[PDB]
Symmetry: C2
Subunit: 204 residues, 2 copies
Amino acid sequence: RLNIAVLPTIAPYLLPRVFPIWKKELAGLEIHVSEMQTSRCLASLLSGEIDMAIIASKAETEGLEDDLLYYEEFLGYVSRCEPLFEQDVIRTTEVNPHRLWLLGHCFRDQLVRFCAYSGGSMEAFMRLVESGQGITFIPQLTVEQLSPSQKELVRPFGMPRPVREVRLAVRQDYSRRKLREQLIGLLRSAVPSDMHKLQTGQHL
Amino acid sequence: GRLNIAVLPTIAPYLLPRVFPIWKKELAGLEIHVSEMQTSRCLASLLSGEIDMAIIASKAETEGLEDDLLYYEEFLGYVSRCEPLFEQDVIRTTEVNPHRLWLLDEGHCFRDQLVRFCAYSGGSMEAFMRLVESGQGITFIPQLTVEQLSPSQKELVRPFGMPRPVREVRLAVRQDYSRRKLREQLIGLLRSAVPSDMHKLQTGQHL
């Protein structure tokens, strides 16, 4: 049995894709997902309670390697009552500070960088925008798991458009290493190929 | 004024979007901060003094906490196309198998009310709803959610068999507090933010 870990910002979008692959390509191994924050993921890889983690960054912590899986682009999610609804692309510096939502843990880190509700959860903000009040950002992978009436309510970023990088982070002192290779290959296989090679116009 | 309301993850995404537009108007000039938090942490923060009120899922239960009733919220099945329950128009409480079910582990009033009334731990609400949409498993969900669902999501809900289970949203604060004038404003207001049908326990409703 192995135990993979995942961040709330990736889990609900990746997992629905990956689970079937775990049944076919591996064959019955007691795998289970465990949702956890980016900071606790790392600490738990070190502590030994967890064996593997799909995280949003590199580790940069002794005793942890981290191999890259794929790239996932941030996109604007702009509510109906905004002046941005008219534009077809998010100008990085034409937004309003008194209506954006964000989560400390990898989502604000990349977005607040250039930019009354803390401890949030993706869906809540995503719904506020659907309601017609505010803006929030979203991982590209998610936009296609939206109803058609939902999808019209997204807008791409303007080049150079910001992007995060999902990666699988593990501890150097790992026993079954054979697997780390297997799992890495499957996870990259879980998402389409089109967002695996950094194209022109992506600068973190 | 600098009230701090708390909400559970199972209420925040459904109730909050309702209140905020209403909260801009009636409570004019108040620097509020809403914060998603567990029910146990809610109470633990009610006592410490960092937050004044919590929209919670049960009675307050524990000396020093009052709780006024807000509303009642019914659970519904959320069943994937590849489940055998899709065939029924209602979930018989005891015709489901625990090999394709998901839930918010063993804590908080999604599990608190359901395992009592019944691999993926440390769960997250949204993850379960989308996973079922993919075609793998079942999870149950508070009625309020269904009101924000498109036609394709809505097609794959199946209610509970009567008596249908229901949880109880309430507003909880510690007595030692000045602005009761406001707190009340809040109880009636939150009640006003939601549809009318969820104020009176209807017929075929339990807990």
